[PDB]
């Protein structure tokens, strides 16, 4: 009611942030520990603590813990914990409304950041993975038998996740927590079976991309060993590379109903359940694969057409490939709502 | 919640500097084995009907979340134990399990990211005594558990859970099935109730 002195300090003096607004569809990131790596065009030397990175989640600005190491001098690493709110496209978040989430990154009183040119995505966590074997649908966080109680060649399970849809040339990593493994080598355990399975690792798996039209072979038809080691078998991770997966998202819990899914199958040698039933004497009980949990890690790289960068201005963002206006003088802004172009703006100032 | 404490017409209380918390009772503990979810106040088989190495169950409780360096105590009420030592009962099994207590357990903190080993990877004996086996309590120390609270009955869906697993020696169900003669039926761990006690500072 008393008015305000022009260009005078107030209680809400917000420092001007200079940076970029990144708009990408790969920032869905439902839950888990989330890592985002940004590749800048030029080597940038600056303080890590001076940065300010926030992600849009509905109507909230969630902060990101910047990596203080700042190694390689050319990338920025942002982390999100599993406790954090799931990331959602912004909706009336300080004015902007976008169909996919945005990343706001900028700094102040220091050399500016170069334009962002590459985005890398890494997630670990199985809490949003649809997993189901031939027997049915089982939770990846509970006990399950991935290959059934009597596995044979071609038996296996299927997986799908909303994050994988829309990506290309991605990487998927799986680590199963085995339970009830023999205390000795499988060759020692399967001593009397013919042929005797020496050199633990003969159990191989294959990855398939299953659609309603056809099946495709992943990892160039190579097979990976489930177990390794000369002594007792040791569980090891499994890695697959997915092709361009551009399919609509569904909500069916079973991955089979999805238009595309990832299927893992036994490849070379069975655990000899048929042999044991053939001659059930002088042999140990054949090992039935049992899993208590299955850890899932996902990684992908953003293509140039999957993200957009906007330069930052004190009250908005400029268009792409446009240099933001430079600050040389103090500026005052006025806004009018219900006026039309070509009309006359008539104002009265009361000043001293 | 707040605590109101005071007195009158007497010397005043000094300022409170430390709080210790102790609860006993399993009526608010989510307990589930590999087979499924069972009530801790009813009959259950903690390690299933055919236990092996690594088999076990999981537990969680809202009181444990938000604490740090806490203490958890469990006392299972065993049923159908042999009237003699397990060495006597498992006389013909090779190797013969002398010195009852070879059945050991391990505690894990299970999250969606990884598993962590509790009690510095030590193992505790389920039973003790030279005669008939005697049930004994099990103690674990938990790390800083700062996770949000959920409502799912199954402890697996929770962000963090406490998992107990068999460590050293099985009850020899595989040996019995391989040569089922001149041997007694192997003991299947059965529990009528499981008492739970919690402590923290």
Q: Is there a contact between A82 and B159 if contact means CB atoms under 8 Å apart?
A: yes
- Cis peptide upstream of residue B95 (ω within 30 degrees of 0): yes
- B49 near B42, Cβ under 8 Å? no
Residues 126-165 of A with CB under 8 A from B: 126-127, 139, 141-143
Q: What is the strand order of the sheet B191-200 is part of? A: B21-24, B191-200, B70-78, B138-142
* Rounded-to-integer distance, Cα A99 and Cα A89, Å: 6
Sheet holding A18-24, edge to edge: A60-63, A52-57, A102-107, A18-24, A307-313, A316-317
Indicate the burial class of A11 (C-beta count within 10 angstroms; 0-12, 13-18, 19 or more). Answer: exposed
Strands A156-160 and A130-133, sheet pairing: antiparallel
Mention every residue, 6+ apart, whose C-beta is less than 8 A from residue A275. Answer: A193, A194, A283, A286
Cα–Cα distance, A339 to B71 (Å, whole number)? 69
Residue A234 pairs in a beta bridge with: A228
**Encoded tokens for B157:** 């869906």
Burial A100-111, CB ≥16 within 10 A → b, else e: bbbbbbbbeeee
Q: Are A298 and A122 in contact (CB under 8 A)?
A: yes
How many contacts (CB atoms, under 8 Å) link A and B?
49
- Chain-chain contact of B34 with A180 (C-beta, under 8 angstroms): no
With b for 16 or more beta-carbon neighbours within 10 A and e for fewer, the A179-191 pattern comes to: bbbbeebbeebbe
| CA–CA distance, A10 with A15 (Å, rounded to integer) | 12
Phi, psi of A257 (to 5 degrees): -65, -20
- Compute the nearest-CA separation of A73 from chain B (Å): 29
In A, which residues are within 8 Å of B173 by CB distance?
none
Residue pair A280/A268 in contact by the 8 Å Cβ criterion: no
Which of A32, A178, A285 has its CB closest to that of B112?
A: A32
Find the closest chain B residue to A34 by CA distance: B113
Asked if the bond preceding A195 is cis, omega within 30° of 0, the reply is: yes
Bridge partners of residue A118, in order along the sequence: A39
Q: Which of A32, A125, A141 sits opposite B157 (nearest CB)?
A: A141
- The residue assigned the tokens 């009597």 is A150
Q: Two tokens at A6?
A: 């022009």
Reduced to 3 states (helix: H, G, I; strand: E, B; else coil), residue B120 is helix
Closest CA to A162 of A27, A292, A306, A301: A27
Q: Which residue of B has its CA nearest to A175?
A: B114
3-state SS assignment for residue B21: strand
A22, β-bridge pairs: A103, A309
Q: Please, which residues bridge with residue A36 across strands?
A: A78, A121
Q: Decide if B40 contacts B174 (C-beta within 8 A).
A: no
3-state SS string over B27-86? CCCEEEECCCECCCCCCECCCCCCCCCCCEEEEECCCCCCCCCEEEEEEEEECCCCCCCH
Output the CA–CA distances (angstroms, integers) from residue A322 to A313, B63, B72, in the order listed.
Answer: 11, 55, 61
- Look up residue A291 and give its two tokens: 């899993």
**Specified resolution (Å):** 2.7
User: Around Cβ A192, how many Cβ atoms within 10 Å?
Assistant: 13
Smallest CA–CA distance from A281 into chain B, residue: B178
Among the partner-chain residues B54, B111, B156, the one whose CB lies closest to the CB of A180 is B54
A183 near B CB under 8 A? yes
Asked if B85 and B130 count as a contact pair (C-beta separation under 8 A), the reply is yes
Distance of CA B126 to the CA centre of its chain: 9
Q: Whose CA is closest to A159, among A34, A241, A253?
A: A253
**CB of B54 within 8 Å of any CB in chain A?**
yes
From B112, which residue of chain A is nearest by alpha-carbon distance? A125
| Probe site for chain B from A177, A183, A280, A293 (most B CB atoms < 10 A) | A293
Residues 6 or more apart whose CB falls under 8 angstroms from that of B118 comprise B106, B107, B108, B109, B140, B141, B142, B143, B162
Which SS3 state, helix, strand or coil, does residue B183 take? Answer: coil
Rounded CA separation A129/B158 (Å): 16
Distance in angstroms (rounded) separating the CA atoms of residues A205 and A269: 10
Q: What is the largest CA-CA distance in chain A?
A: 106
Minimum CA–CA partner of A182 in chain B: B53
- Which of B34, B54, B156 has the CB atom closest to A141's CB atom? B156
First-to-last CA distance in chain B? 17
Query: Which residues in chain A have Cβ-Cβ distances shorter than 8 Å to B174?
Result: 284-285
Helical (H) or strand (E) element with B174: helix B173-178
What is d(CA B50, CA B47) in angstroms, rounded to the nearest whole number? 7
DSSP state of B159: S
What determination technique applies here? cryo-EM
Q: Please give the helix or strand (H or E) that residue B22 lies within, else none.
A: strand B21-24
Return the structure tokens found at B73.
Answer: 């105590």
The rounded distance, in Å, linking the Cα atoms of A104 and A20 is 6
Closest to A118 in 3D by CA, of A323, A309, A257: A309
CA distance A304 to A26: 12
Locate tokens 């919640």: which residue? B1
User: Cβ separation of A127 and B114 shorter than 8 Å?
Assistant: no
User: Is B97 strand, coil or helix?
Assistant: coil
As a whole number of angstroms, the distance between CA B165 and CA B128 comes to: 18
B113: nearest CB among A124, A143, A183: A124
A147, two tokens = 């290959």
* β-pair partners for A170: A242
HEC string of chain A equals CCCCCCCCCCCCCCCCCEEEEEEEHHHCCCCCEEEEEEEECCCCCCCCCCCEEEEEECCEEEECEECCCCCCCCEEEEEECCCCCCCCCCCCECCECCCCCEEEEEECCCCCCCCEEEEEEEEECCCCCEEEECCCECCCCCCECCCCCCCCCCCEEEEECCCCCCCCCEEEEEEEEECCCCCCCHHHHCCCCCCCCCCCCCCEEEEEEEECCCEEECHHHCCEECEECCCCCEECCEEEEECCCCCCCCCCCCHHHCCEEEEEEECCCCCCHHHHHHCCCCCCCCCCCCEEEEEEEEEEECCHHHEEEEEEECCEECCCCCCCCCCCCCCCCCCCCCCCCCCCCCCCCCCC
**Distance, CA of A317 to CA of A19 (rounded, Å):** 10
CB-based contact A180 B55, cutoff 8 Å: yes
Whether B53 and A183 lie within 8 Å, measured CB to CB = yes
A157, A147 Cβ separation under 8 angstroms:
yes
Contact yes or no for A219/A241 (Cβ under 8 A): yes
Burial B33-53 (b: 16+ CB within 10 A, else e): bbeeebebeeebbbbbebbbb
């Amino acid at each position: 009611e008393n008015g305000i002195q022009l260009f005078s300090p107030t209680a809400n003096d917000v420092a001007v942030l200079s940076g970029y607004l990144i708009k990408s569809s790969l920032f869905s990131m439902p839950e888990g520990e989330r890592h985002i790596t940004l590749t800048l065009e030029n080597d940038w030397e600056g303080q890590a603590e001076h940065l300010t990175a926030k992600i849009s989640t509905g109507d909230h600005w969630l902060s990101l813990s910047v990596n203080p190491n700042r190694t390689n001098k050319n990338t920025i690493e942002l982390e999100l914990s599993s406790t954090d709110d799931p990331i959602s496209p912004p909706d009336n978040l300080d004015g902007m409304t976008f169909d996919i989430p945005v990343l706001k990154l900028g700094t102040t009183q220091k050399p500016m950041l170069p334009k962002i040119t590459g985005i890398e995505i890494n997630i670990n966590g199985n809490r949003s993975v649809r997993y189901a074997s031939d027997g049915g649908i089982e939770q990846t966080d509970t006990t399950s038998s991935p290959f059934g109680q009597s596995p044979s060649l071609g038996s296996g399970f299927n997986l799908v996740a909303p994050e994988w849809y829309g990506t290309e040339n991605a990487t998927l990593t799986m680590t199963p927590q085995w339970v009830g493994l023999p205390t000795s080598s499988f060759s020692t355990w399967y001593d009397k079976y013919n042929p005797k399975p020496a050199s633990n690792g003969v159990f191989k798996v294959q990855g398939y991309l299953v659609t309603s039209q056809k099946r495709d072979v992943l990892n160039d038809a190579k097979s990976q060993p489930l177990f390794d080691g000369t002594g007792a078998p040791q569980g090891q991770s499994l890695t697959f590379i997915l092709p361009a997966m551009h399919y609509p998202l569904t909500d069916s819990p079973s991955p089979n109903e999805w238009p595309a899914s990832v299927r893992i199958e036994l490849a070379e040698q069975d655990f000899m359940h048929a042999q044991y039933w053939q001659n059930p004497t002088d042999k140990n009980v054949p090992y039935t694969p049992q899993i208590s949990a299955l850890q899932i890690q996902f990684s992908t790289t953003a293509k140039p057409e999957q993200f957009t960068v906007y330069p930052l201005t004190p009250f908005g963002w400029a268009n792409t490939n446009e240099d933001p206006p430079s600050f040389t003088n103090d500026a005052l802004y006025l806004g009018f709502t219900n006026v039309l172009p070509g009309q006359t703006l008539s104002l009265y100032w009361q000043l001293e």
